[PDB]
From Swiss-Prot, chain A:
Subunit structure: Light intermediate chain of the cytoplasmic dynein complex 2, a multisubunit complex composed at least of eleven different proteins. The cytoplasmic dynein 2 complex consists of two catalytic heavy chains (HCs) and a number of non-catalytic subunits presented by intermediate chains (ICs), light intermediate chains (LICs) and light chains (LCs).
Gene that encodes it: DYNC2LI1
Family note: Belongs to the dynein light intermediate chain family.
Function, as annotated: Acts as one of several non-catalytic accessory components of the cytoplasmic dynein 2 complex (dynein-2 complex), a motor protein complex that drives the movement of cargos along microtubules within cilia and flagella in concert with the intraflagellar transport (IFT) system, facilitating the assembly of these organelles. Involved in the regulation of ciliary length.
Localisation per UniProt entry: Golgi apparatus; Cytoplasm; Cell projection, Cilium; Cytoplasm, Cytoskeleton, Cilium basal body
Lineage: Eukaryota, Metazoa, Chordata, Craniata, Vertebrata
Organism: Homo sapiens
Protein name in the entry: Cytoplasmic dynein 2 light intermediate chain 1
Swiss-Prot record, chain B:
Signal peptide: none
Disease: Short-rib thoracic dysplasia 8 with or without polydactyly: A form of short-rib thoracic dysplasia, a group of autosomal recessive ciliopathies that are characterized by a constricted thoracic cage, short ribs, shortened tubular bones, and a 'trident' appearance of the acetabular roof. Polydactyly is variably present. Non-skeletal involvement can include cleft lip/palate as well as anomalies of major organs such as the brain, eye, heart, kidneys, liver, pancreas, intestines, and genitalia.
This protein's name: Cytoplasmic dynein 2 intermediate chain 1
Known partners and oligomeric status: Intermediate chain of the cytoplasmic dynein complex 2, a multisubunit complex, composed at least of eleven different proteins. The cytoplasmic dynein 2 complex consists of two catalytic heavy chains (HCs) and a number of non-catalytic subunits presented by intermediate chains (ICs), light intermediate chains (LICs) and light chains (LCs).
Family: Belongs to the dynein light intermediate chain family.
Job description of the protein: Acts as one of several non-catalytic accessory components of the cytoplasmic dynein 2 complex (dynein-2 complex), a motor protein complex that drives the movement of cargos along microtubules within cilia and flagella in concert with the intraflagellar transport (IFT) system. DYNC2I1 plays a major role in retrograde ciliary protein trafficking in cilia and flagella. Also requires to maintain a functional transition zone.
Tissue: Expressed in chondrocytes (at protein level).
Lineage: Eukaryota, Metazoa, Chordata, Craniata, Vertebrata
Organism: Homo sapiens
Parent sequence residues shown: 534 to 582 of 1066
Subcellular location as annotated: Cell projection, Cilium; Cytoplasm, Cytoskeleton, Microtubule organizing center, Centrosome
Domain of life of the native organism: Eukaryota
Length: 36, 44
């Protein structure tokens, strides 16, 4: 069990920013085009 | 022999390294350039 839903939890600005961060960081790591 | 020896020498100076460069007063953020990670946006 990991509970990625995080249902018994709440936040407005913290979760919005986290969604933004997730997308921006994930795309940046792909662009690095590491051969590793 | 009066001219007991005649020593020859070669001399060569070095070369000068030059490059072509652009400049312009009115323009874009990058003024001139010599003739895609984008990690630049992330801090903001």
């Amino acid at each position: 069990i990991k509970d990625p839903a995080r249902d018994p939890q709440y936040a407005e600005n913290e979760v919005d920013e986290m969604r933004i961060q997730k997308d921006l960081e994930l795309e940046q790591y792909k662009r690095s085009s590491s051969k590793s | 022999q009066c001219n007991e020896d005649n020593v020859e020498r070669d001399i060569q100076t070095e070369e000068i390294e030059t490059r072509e460069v652009w400049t312009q007063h009115p323009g874009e953020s990058t003024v001139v350039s010599g003739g895609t990670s984008d990690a630049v946006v992330m801090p903001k």
